[PDB]
Amino acid sequence: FCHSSFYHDTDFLGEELDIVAAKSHEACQKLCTNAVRCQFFTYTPAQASCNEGKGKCYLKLSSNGSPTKILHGRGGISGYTLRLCKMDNE
Amino acid sequence: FCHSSFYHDTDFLGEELDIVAAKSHEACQKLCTNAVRCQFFTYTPAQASCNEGKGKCYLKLSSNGSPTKILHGRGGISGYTLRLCKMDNE
């Protein structure tokens, strides 16, 4: 089964990685529902920086021969969605 | 003299990664003085703006012989020189 799990204060770096957000925290989740298996759809909660330092959503994809590159410490909140499982090992 | 890698705005990620504070820029350079394995680190000068603290230094390894991933959004300047890049392939 493809179970959705969320872990924060820890991030795992895959391969294909971009960064897109503007507003509406929940809304950017659907950015990977366009056709995006989104193997990791993760967030990085911020605001205490420069007035308005709002959401920047983290999207990366790996589980091939390249497993994960671990980022320790100040990670936001990374969640596994659903369709990633079927794309897990392409 | 070897493979001095200095990227601007764009972050080239291979395999290993860890973050140290950028409190005194020389500090993270000293990571290489404890163990010459750091091939290139990502620097972000996030201080002169709002945060009176400092930024951070992304110590990473494998530039060339790794799956070279090019990502953006959190990049500043990834810079190092060294001679250890000899073992970058193996």
From Swiss-Prot, chains A, B:
Residues 2-85 form the Apple domain. Changing residue 58 to A: Reduces dimerization. It comes from the Eukaryota. Disulfide bonds join 2-85, 28-57, 32-38. This is Coagulation factor XIa heavy chain. It comes from Homo sapiens. The gene is F11. The chain holds residues 290 to 379 of 625 of the full protein.
